[PDB]
Design an enzyme around this catalytic site. Structure first.
Site, PDB file in Angstrom:
ATOM      1  N   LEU A  13     -40.011  21.222 -10.674  1.00 35.07           N
ATOM      2  CA  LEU A  13     -40.759  22.443 -10.987  1.00 35.07           C
ATOM      3  C   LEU A  13     -40.215  23.215 -12.195  1.00 35.07           C
ATOM      4  O   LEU A  13     -40.951  23.969 -12.839  1.00 35.07           O
ATOM      5  CB  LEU A  13     -40.761  23.380  -9.771  1.00 35.07           C
ATOM      6  N   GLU A  15     -36.250  23.688 -14.879  1.00 34.66           N
ATOM      7  CA  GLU A  15     -34.829  23.454 -15.190  1.00 34.66           C
ATOM      8  C   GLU A  15     -34.281  24.682 -15.924  1.00 34.66           C
ATOM      9  O   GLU A  15     -35.014  25.648 -16.129  1.00 34.66           O
ATOM     10  CB  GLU A  15     -34.657  22.180 -16.035  1.00 34.66           C
ATOM     11  N   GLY A  16     -33.000  24.658 -16.296  1.00 34.83           N
ATOM     12  CA  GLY A  16     -32.394  25.768 -17.052  1.00 34.83           C
ATOM     13  C   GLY A  16     -31.186  26.392 -16.370  1.00 34.83           C
ATOM     14  O   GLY A  16     -31.190  26.601 -15.153  1.00 34.83           O
ATOM     15  N   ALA A  17     -30.182  26.740 -17.178  1.00 40.59           N
ATOM     16  CA  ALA A  17     -28.818  26.998 -16.703  1.00 40.59           C
ATOM     17  C   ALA A  17     -28.167  25.630 -16.521  1.00 40.59           C
ATOM     18  O   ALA A  17     -28.310  24.759 -17.384  1.00 40.59           O
ATOM     19  CB  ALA A  17     -28.811  27.804 -15.398  1.00 40.59           C
ATOM     20  N   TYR A  18     -27.448  25.434 -15.422  1.00 38.67           N
ATOM     21  CA  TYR A  18     -27.078  24.088 -14.999  1.00 38.67           C
ATOM     22  C   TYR A  18     -27.700  23.871 -13.618  1.00 38.67           C
ATOM     23  O   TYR A  18     -27.004  23.761 -12.601  1.00 38.67           O
ATOM     24  CB  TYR A  18     -25.552  23.894 -15.020  1.00 38.67           C
ATOM     25  N   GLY A  19     -29.033  23.834 -13.611  1.00 42.81           N
ATOM     26  CA  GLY A  19     -29.804  23.646 -12.387  1.00 42.81           C
ATOM     27  C   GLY A  19     -31.224  23.139 -12.595  1.00 42.81           C
ATOM     28  O   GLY A  19     -31.714  23.035 -13.727  1.00 42.81           O
ATOM     29  N   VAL A  21     -35.217  23.314 -10.221  1.00 41.31           N
ATOM     30  CA  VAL A  21     -35.965  23.737  -9.049  1.00 41.31           C
ATOM     31  C   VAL A  21     -36.866  22.554  -8.692  1.00 41.31           C
ATOM     32  O   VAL A  21     -37.577  22.037  -9.558  1.00 41.31           O
ATOM     33  CB  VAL A  21     -36.787  25.031  -9.306  1.00 41.31           C
ATOM     34  N   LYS A  36     -33.899  25.483  -5.181  1.00 43.34           N
ATOM     35  CA  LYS A  36     -33.165  25.710  -6.425  1.00 43.34           C
ATOM     36  C   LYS A  36     -31.804  25.073  -6.245  1.00 43.34           C
ATOM     37  O   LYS A  36     -31.030  25.474  -5.371  1.00 43.34           O
ATOM     38  CB  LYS A  36     -33.033  27.209  -6.755  1.00 43.34           C
ATOM     39  N   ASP A 121     -34.495  41.024 -15.993  1.00 40.59           N
ATOM     40  CA  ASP A 121     -35.061  39.990 -16.858  1.00 40.59           C
ATOM     41  C   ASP A 121     -36.536  39.708 -16.562  1.00 40.59           C
ATOM     42  O   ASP A 121     -36.957  38.563 -16.457  1.00 40.59           O
ATOM     43  CB  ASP A 121     -34.249  38.689 -16.784  1.00 40.59           C
TER      44      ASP A 121
HETATM   45  N1  LIG Z   1     -40.327  29.433  -6.086  1.00 41.89           N
HETATM   46  C1  LIG Z   1     -40.973  28.763  -7.075  1.00 41.89           C
HETATM   47  N2  LIG Z   1     -42.235  28.287  -6.870  1.00 41.89           N
HETATM   48  C2  LIG Z   1     -42.871  27.643  -7.847  1.00 41.89           C
HETATM   49  C3  LIG Z   1     -42.237  27.426  -9.085  1.00 41.89           C
HETATM   50  C4  LIG Z   1     -43.001  26.765 -10.171  1.00 41.89           C
HETATM   51  C5  LIG Z   1     -42.717  27.117 -11.498  1.00 41.89           C
HETATM   52  C6  LIG Z   1     -43.444  26.559 -12.548  1.00 41.89           C
HETATM   53  C7  LIG Z   1     -44.480  25.665 -12.270  1.00 41.89           C
HETATM   54  C8  LIG Z   1     -44.783  25.344 -10.941  1.00 41.89           C
HETATM   55  O1  LIG Z   1     -45.787  24.482 -10.639  1.00 41.89           O
HETATM   56  C9  LIG Z   1     -44.058  25.903  -9.899  1.00 41.89           C
HETATM   57  N3  LIG Z   1     -40.981  27.906  -9.309  1.00 41.89           N
HETATM   58  C10 LIG Z   1     -40.330  28.546  -8.296  1.00 41.89           C
HETATM   59  C11 LIG Z   1     -38.977  29.141  -8.467  1.00 41.89           C
HETATM   60  C12 LIG Z   1     -38.712  29.851  -9.641  1.00 41.89           C
HETATM   61  C13 LIG Z   1     -37.482  30.475  -9.835  1.00 41.89           C
HETATM   62  C14 LIG Z   1     -36.515  30.426  -8.842  1.00 41.89           C
HETATM   63  C15 LIG Z   1     -35.181  31.082  -9.025  1.00 41.89           C
HETATM   64  O2  LIG Z   1     -34.699  31.746  -8.076  1.00 41.89           O
HETATM   65  O3  LIG Z   1     -34.578  30.944 -10.103  1.00 41.89           O
HETATM   66  C16 LIG Z   1     -36.783  29.727  -7.673  1.00 41.89           C
HETATM   67  C17 LIG Z   1     -38.006  29.093  -7.465  1.00 41.89           C
END
Ligand SMILES: Nc1ncc(-c2cccc(O)c2)nc1-c1ccc(C(=O)O)cc1
EC number: 2.7.11.1
Length: 269
Positions: A13, A15-19, A21, A36, A121
């Site tokens: 879903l 990327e970014g940092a050293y991780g 999702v 994550k 942010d």
């Molecule tokens: N919880 C989330 N649900 C959907 C998507 C996502 C992001 C972009 C495209 C897509 O199809 C799905 N990204 C996340 C997400 C985003 C950021 C974090 C975080 O805590 O950094 C955790 C989870």
């Protein structure tokens, strides 16, 4: 029930940092969550802040698990992706959509602020959409406590993302948390309505920022924005954070309260 704790990682879903999702799907139930994955080679604070959060316009934290050095955060899956991708370059989006997204963003930010949390942010990459286009504030990696025991702490760490950051963060050693998040919400609104960002940063050496201070709203992006929302932006994008409009007053703004959007089947005879 055997197997109910097993999740298949089925799609990257982000990327970014050293991780990364990952989309995780439950083997038994088929529940989809976002996981994550952070290789610890900060995340304790992010988890701690996440555990405080329970609101419909904030990404829900379900829990965490650590396996060695890889930490796993289980988060609410948002199938609509990023608000960033609903913004057409140079266009924005329909004004009623932007107003609805802005309402939900304020509700989320009102909630964080009332529990003493600043996100720090806010930007369209961090504003996610569920399957019904409900907006969810995500990623509490830069987030911090600005109020505790009813006592406000002033911030001094420079962070966020330059095009979205408030000018006081570049000018002053200390600053109040809340006006900073308000400012970034104004830049998000500008983006939703113009499909472009007004300046690289809000500094006196940024010509586009200088033009705004001099009220040249015959230029872009402002010329693309109707006078009603533009009047809200004039109150948000105020250089002095003490004179900047607060959220309670945003909620009384004329554009904010303008009926624009029909609700989300039917037959005739
Ligand atoms: N919880 C989330 N649900 C959907 C998507 C996502 C992001 C972009 C495209 C897509 O199809 C799905 N990204 C996340 C997400 C985003 C950021 C974090 C975080 O805590 O950094 C955790 C989870």
């Amino acid at each position: 029930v055997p197997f109910v704790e097993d999740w298949d990682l089925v799609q990257t879903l982000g990327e970014g940092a050293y991780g990364e999702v990952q989309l995780a799907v439950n083997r038994v139930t088929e529940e989809a969550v976002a996981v994550k994955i952070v290789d610890m080679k900060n995340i304790k604070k992010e988890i701690c802040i996440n555990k405080m959060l329970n609101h419909e316009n904030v990404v829900k934290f379900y829990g965490h698990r650590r396996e060695g050095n890889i930490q796993y955060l289980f988060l609410e899956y948002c199938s609509g992706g990023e608000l960033f991708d609903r913004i057409e370059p140079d266009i924005g989006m329909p004004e009623p959509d932007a107003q609805r997204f802005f309402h939900q963003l304020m509700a989320g930010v009102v909630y964080l602020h009332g529990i003493g949390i600043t996100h720090r942010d806010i930007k369209p990459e961090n504003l996610l959409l569920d399957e019904r286009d409900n907006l969810k504030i995500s990623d509490f990696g830069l987030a911090t406590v600005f109020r505790y025991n009813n006592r406000e702490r002033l911030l001094n760490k420079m962070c966020g993302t330059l095009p979205y950051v408030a000018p006081e963060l570049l000018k002053r050693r200390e600053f109040h948390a809340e006006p900073v998040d308000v400012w970034s919400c104004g830049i998000v609104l500008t983006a939703m309505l113009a499909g472009e960002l007004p300046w690289d940063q809000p500094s006196d050496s940024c010509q586009e920022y200088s033009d705004w201070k001099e009220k040249k709203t015959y230029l872009n992006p402002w010329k693309k924005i109707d006078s009603a929302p533009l009047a809200l932006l004039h109150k948000i994008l105020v250089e002095n954070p003490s004179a900047r409009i607060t959220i309670p007053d945003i909620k009384k703004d004329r554009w904010y309260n303008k009926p624009l959007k029909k609700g989300a089947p039917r037959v005739t005879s």
